[PDB]
Amino acid sequence: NPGLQLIIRNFWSHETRLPSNTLDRLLALNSLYSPKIEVHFLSLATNFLLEMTSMSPDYPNPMFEHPLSECEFQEYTIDSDWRFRSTVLTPMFVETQASQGPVAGQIRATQQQHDFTLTQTQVVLYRSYRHGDLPDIQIKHSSLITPLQAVAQRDPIIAKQLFSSLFSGILKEMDKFKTLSEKNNITQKLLQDFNRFLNTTFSFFPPFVSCIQDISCQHAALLSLDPAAVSAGCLASLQQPVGIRLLEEALLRLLPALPPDVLRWVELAKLYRSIGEYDVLRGIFTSEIGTKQITQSALLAEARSDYSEAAKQYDEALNKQDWVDGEPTEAEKDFWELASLDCYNHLAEWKSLEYCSTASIDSENPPDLNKIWSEPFYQETYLPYMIRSKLKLLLQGEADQSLLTFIDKAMHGELQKAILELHYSQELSLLYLLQDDVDRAKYYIQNGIQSFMQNYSSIDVLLHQSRLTKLQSVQALTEIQEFISFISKQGNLSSQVPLKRLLNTWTNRYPDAKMDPMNIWDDIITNRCFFLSKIEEKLTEDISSLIRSCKFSMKMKMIDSARKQNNFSLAMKLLKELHKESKTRDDWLVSWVQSYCRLSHCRSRSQGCSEQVLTVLKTVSLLDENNVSSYLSKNILAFRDQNILLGTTYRIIANALSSEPACLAEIEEDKARRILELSGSSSEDSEKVIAGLYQRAFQHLSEAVQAAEEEAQPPPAAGVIDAYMTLADFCDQQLRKEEENASVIDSAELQAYPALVVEKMLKALKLNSNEARLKFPRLLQIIERYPEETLSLMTKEISSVPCWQFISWISHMVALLDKDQAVAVQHSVEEITDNYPQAIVYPFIISSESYSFKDTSTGHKNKEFVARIKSKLDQGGVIQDFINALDQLSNPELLFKDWSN
Amino acid sequence: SPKMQLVCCRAIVKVFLALAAKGPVLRNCISTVVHQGLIRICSKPVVLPTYKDYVDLFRHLLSSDQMMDSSESLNHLLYDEFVKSVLKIVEKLDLTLEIAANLHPAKPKDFSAFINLVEFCREILPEKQAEFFEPWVYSFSYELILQSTRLPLISGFYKLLSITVRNAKKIKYFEGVPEKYSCFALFVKFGKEVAVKMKQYKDELLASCLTFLLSLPHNIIELDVRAYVPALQMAFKLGLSYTPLAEVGLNALEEWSIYIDRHVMQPYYKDILPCLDGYLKTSALAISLEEIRIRVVQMLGSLGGQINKNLLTVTSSDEMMKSYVAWDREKRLSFAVPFREMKPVIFLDVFLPRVTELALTASDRQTKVAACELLHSMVMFMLGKATQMPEGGQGAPPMYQLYKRTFPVLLRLACDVDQVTRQLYEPLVMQLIHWFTNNKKFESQDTVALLEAILDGIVDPVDSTLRDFCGRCIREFLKWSIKQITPQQQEKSPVNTKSLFKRLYSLALHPNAFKRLGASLAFNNIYREFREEESLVEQFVFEALVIYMESLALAHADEKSLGTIQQCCDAIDHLCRIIEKKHVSLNKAKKRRLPRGFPPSASLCLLDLVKWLLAHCGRPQTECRHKSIELFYKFVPLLPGNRSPNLWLKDVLKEEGVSFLINTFEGGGCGQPSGILAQPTLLYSLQATLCWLDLLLAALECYNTFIGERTVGALQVLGTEAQSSLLKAVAFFLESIAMHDIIAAEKCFGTGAAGNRTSPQEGERYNYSKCTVVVRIMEFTTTLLNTSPEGWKLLKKDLCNTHLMRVLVQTLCEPASIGFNIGDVQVMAHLPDVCVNLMKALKMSPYKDILETHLREKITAQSIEELCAVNL
Amino acid sequence: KECSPWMSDFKVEFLRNELEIPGQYDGRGKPLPEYHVRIAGFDERVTVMASLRRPKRIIIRGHDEREHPFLVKGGEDLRQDQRVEQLFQV
């Protein structure tokens, strides 16, 4: 009842019952807070002020003090910087355009007669305004403030914006009314109850909370807010942005005066952590909050995405009890104590993860699970990892009901139910499936969907990082949903057919190997592995071996991501789960070998020479496994791949050696022999073993390419292309070693290579190779070096390449229609013309103004072809007067300046 | 009681077997006995015993169950006539357009039962005919497409055609891409059809037709899906206020995302996912709407993480995120609070972008009615500060930024459906105009801002009510923009008049139809307040005229159903209505604004204009042509000689020769546009045949006037050289394309597409336009004979006229093989009555016998129709 | 119309090879001029920008009805910078 609010105002308004000087009013408006007003509170806290206004002797009185109806105009007769901004927006006209070289304050008044016989179914006069022509001359401050209040209740957003704007102003009368002591004693109580607000709000309705913070921007003394209260606010509030701002202004404006900064820094970091911007956090720690050499050094390898030694560097620091000061700070320790955890989380290092997530819990070597409830710090910090790790171990088929124990113990409680039903309904659902329960899993997942929708839909649109970070989980929830559905329906357990179909969906529905991060891969992979173990139990071609086929393949696709994303350390773990297991099927073994070798290769970039050679030496020993030769003699695809890797292996070595040719000496002598041995140039000259190696390499490659050219013509292309390219890549570096070198001993060896490469790339380019298309200009400079016997081959070949592959490089192509190598391109360029005239034309123009032909049949042929192109563009010659038309826009005096230069 | 219903099906089943035991006669009879019966269930009532009720009986009859054992395919031969009769019944139905872009069915019965055929056939169709359905799929869909042309604003056809396509998906008829590939080509070229027709459409029409596209088979939709990108984008962007439309988009995106080639789709997804942001944007403080909010997530997951990440790409942000950036970089609206003793200060700038949002939107009545007072009073404060011209050295600061982001608000709030708020703001906007128009020099940024806001309203695609209201503001603008200036300055430079017309012109030259249409409405709404100062019509009027000609020409490519044609007619007509009078003034050579493209000159007069109009005579843009004819006749008699057109022409033909005029009835258009060259069109087909066809029509329509008015003499008109069109283009057409469908051109000229087969959306325009051109020939050729006793002696050198006579016997013996295919007696039943007129000029021409050589020398027989008597 | 009269006519003119907006091609996927937007007129406006060469900003109307603003740099060889873009795509 609005009368009751007013009746309650009857003495809250009263001059002794809330003060009647508006500063002391404001101090006592901070008495008004009770938690059962939040959404509303500001909108009422404000309106009180806008009664105290009323008894100002000008509140009842005009704002404008001349008749706005008269006496006024405006002019923009200026070349201001705001004119540039206005003509950027949309330009206004100008028009001087000259072809050569009645009272004041008065209105042309009506002349009623119409000088027509109208459309159908006298003299000048001057007047001044009717009172209906022009608006209110002179409104009073009264009518400004008055209408707002009733709507300021209803849109708190203006209320927020309003309050701060009052409040901020209200301070800044200063010394002309209030002295140092008074202002500052007041700020202490302001600050104190600003803390009280944040201490007491339990809903955290963000417009209120944000406003207290947005107020805190405005004046220096306000900045000493409880850092943990700010974060505790912001986290529940989704108000991290203002949380950060507050802290950053605190850190700077409190700069000149270190202990509370240290606290602030941790909180600042925690805000960023909750929105996914860890790169900033690295900056905080590396360059202010970390002190020790170890701290950077861990982050460094971690930033390079090798958590393994980073984890151990943290562990080493954590368990180091002695130091050059005895005193890495309470915070740097707190940081390591977290940092180390993520390492394990990415490393899938679940055993150390459950162990470390609990080991620092208060000597619970007898494992109390429930101590977490003692601190929201613990409930936030360790809990997620612990749930995760235990559950991953359970899904890897381990056994310990201590999780369901601790969870069912938690289910007895209120928060110890509710926060799980909110934040972990995924895991709750999975645990019900782990206990064979369809319904309760179906509930907790049904809930999970809704939970996500609100979770995501509450994140700000500008929090792109976190929006994104939420999102991938959807797949897991959906797969849980599909799987639940599939197993809920009895017709799926009768026939192998709908199951064979199911796996095809899961193969087709992977995560992204270059953007989805590894932990997220881990999840779907593990989860499917478990779901298939459940189907495997429901039933038991043999679906079981088909399921292992999937399991294996999936491990591969996962391993592949951890290569492409250089989580090589994780790929070691995964490899060693399969290292012997794969050695069972046939194809499977082959796949394992290949994968291992690829990984060895990727690892073999990041490295020094001996280290690289060592990193690949071992692969030779798998590649010279040849019980597999029976399968390779049957499976050309793999055989090609085998040779590819094999040649690549030698290439790596040969490059490593040739960069630093004596470095063979750095490797332990047995292996230094293994090298010289298996190069086979035991003449024992590194240069000769390198030429030998390269030759040996080329054998595998050339064969691989041949095997690739054979029985591979579908009306899989990746490997075909890959071969052709790979060979070419090698040949190019060699051709460059020749081009780089004045002394050329590698002459008989590098004979085939120029002619050879062509036939590969122009095969590859027919296969739509984007990378060949990116490299293509190479050919155009190679033929110039190798004009003897490139040209013929290239020419009889190149017709077979789609014209629209070339378009990128058109400039080059048209820029050599005058040189004899024109012979290769002339057909091609004409075809491009004959499809895409609007493409070629500008390149052609600029080149047409630039040739000079030879006065010989070769240059005549070219000049005559060019005349045929030129003429076969001059139908568009009609349009391209457009060029001349654009040309008019240049300043003629500038063109004269250029010409006269 | 219910169980007796099976006995009723047994009764009405048995009596259909009885009839079929006649043998061969039956089909027609039963096929039309069911028909007068269906006319009841489909005229049986419903509101927005029913369209639902009889359905099961009909299903049990159109299902070949063992009711005979206890002839089977004849339960389906009954369903066969549920095509045969039912689509032959499109020929039953007639409906066209009588009681700003809405229309009404002239004959309600031919809709009001017929859409309960739709809603009853919404089960009476969807069975696969037990796979017997073959003969219907091609023929049915063909028929219904060819006639769906009759009526836009009909949902029902697209519904039934979509039921056709969905059933055809389960029957997989298009699998592997001859009836199959014929229909395949039809629907593929229908991908250039309703998907292009999109940009006009409106609620249920748009919903029922989107339903159709999105239900099309993926095997088609592997081609150039830029067609359907907007369609699916529309589907989601709309379906949020017709919830089960979005459900079709689920069906489609699902069906696609498996049966489509993933590499084909991988690039495109970027444009689709963003529109699903909104479907998850709030907790809100046919199947149920939160089934949908659920289903999008189920899709996003099943669609897979690989593609999903497209949702959160920066390009998903822009067209919201403009609502999160500052309106001015200063903090503008500085205000001092009256507390009792002392004064704090506020910068109200920051309220405006929220207060506006509410004042436009806020659903609470009691909020909204107060909110407007906020904004109304706050607007005043701006004007206050704009006139807080200080006694200090600082000028009153800029406001353009605010004004721009403010004044469009006010116009929405003025055309606002609420009486009470409108009753405040509708006055307000007038006072604003009245104030703002008071400036003295050329580009007041404020004035510009206001104007541009008004125009940005008058082009608005959706809102005729705004375009209406804005029309008033425009009028009142210009009225007031007269109201505030001295004659001697207005004569020197009519500043805002210039700064208006220039922007009107650009909107008249914009290629988008709505970007033109608004400017014609503005031009109407000022006409009655233009033509008041002498200066205005003295300076602007030719420029104004000429520009509207071009804006008419640009309308040529559009639908007529925007009404731009008519709007432009009035825009030009009212110029004619001015020029009736003030040619008296314009005859003087005086300084004027040079119309777009004239040779620059020291001064201009009505001669220069009418000579330019002459240059426009033979141009292909139809209504431009009709105007330039009519206007030229209205403009000869008022140059300083005031002579007739014939006697005026006598001078320039004596000076320039018929050469000059032919070089404008055929050389007619831009610079030297060379339409005299018939040859390249008789050489080089592409649908640019229609461009030639138009050019021939314009050449003819030129001759279709000036001999007929007898304004140039016939043996002049058919000049002794260079008149290529009549001599070849006509003759050829009659010899070589007239007897034939499109493929006689689309053989030897360029090529005809694919295997020589393409859509009625092409073919109807070809044959329609083709069947126009013959008319204009005949009218023209008659007009030779009926002005000259000699004209037949120059066309006699085209002695091989006789092709035209086989055309003429066709034109009466079955012209439906040529023109009655349109369906509109409005054109298509004057054309025979017009044809027959020419035959007097044949009967009383010496050529008479050759009509007998087409008919009475071959075909005349007396009794054969009495022979057919027992058959009739 | 003061700067350069021809653009202030430029129109659909018939029997004609329609002009595509410059530079729409890129070397991929069998490109399709029937998408590539075609010119259909100019804004009457121009603006000079301040640098020594006083370069001109113009606006092109597509037949696709959006507008495509461009700078015009004359007397100057842009090829150098053009390849910087090719590199940047790479």
From Swiss-Prot, chain A:
Residues 1-540 are annotated as: KIP-binding. TPR repeats lie at residues 262-290, 291-324. It is found in: Nucleus; Nucleus, Nucleolus; Cytoplasm, Cytosol. Residues 258-850 form the FAT domain. Changing residue 404 to R: In IMD26; shows increased long palindromic (P)-nucleotide stretches in the immunoglobulin coding joints indicating a defect in hairpin opening and insufficient DCLRE1C activation. Changing residue 283 to A: In a lung neuroendocrine carcinoma sample; somatic mutation. The modification Phosphoserine is found at residues 99, 143. Autophosphorylated at two clusters, the T2609 cluster and the S2056 cluster. Autophosphorylation induces a conformational change that leads to remodeling of the DNA-PK complex, requisite for efficient end processing and DNA repair. The modification Phosphothreonine is found at residues 22, 96, 110, 119. Changing residue 96 to A: Leads to radiation sensitivity and impaired DSB joining. Gives rise to reduced phosphorylation. The modification N6-acetyllysine is found at residues 557, 576. It is linked to Immunodeficiency 26 with or without neurologic abnormalities: A form of severe combined immunodeficiency characterized by reduced or absent T and B cells, recurrent candidiasis, and lower respiratory tract infections. Some patients show dysmorphic features, severe growth failure, microcephaly, seizures, and impaired neurological functions. DNA-PK is a heterotrimer of PRKDC and the Ku dimer (composed of XRCC6/Ku70 and XRCC5/Ku86). Formation of this complex may be promoted by interaction with ILF3. Component of the core long-range non-homologous end joining (NHEJ) complex (also named DNA-PK complex) composed of PRKDC, LIG4, XRCC4, XRCC6/Ku70, XRCC5/Ku86 and NHEJ1/XLF. Additional component of the NHEJ complex includes PAXX. Following autophosphorylation, PRKDC dissociates from DNA. Interacts with DNA-PKcs-interacting protein (KIP) with the region upstream the kinase domain. Serine/threonine-protein kinase that acts as a molecular sensor for DNA damage. Involved in DNA non-homologous end joining (NHEJ) required for double-strand break (DSB) repair and V(D)J recombination. Must be bound to DNA to express its catalytic properties. Promotes processing of hairpin DNA structures in V(D)J recombination by activation of the hairpin endonuclease artemis (DCLRE1C). Recruited by XRCC5 and XRCC6 to DNA ends and is required to (1) protect and align broken ends of DNA, thereby preventing their degradation, (2) and sequester the DSB for repair by NHEJ. Belongs to the PI3/PI4-kinase family. This is DNA-dependent protein kinase catalytic subunit. The gene is PRKDC. The chain holds residues 2514 to 3590 of 4128 of the full protein.
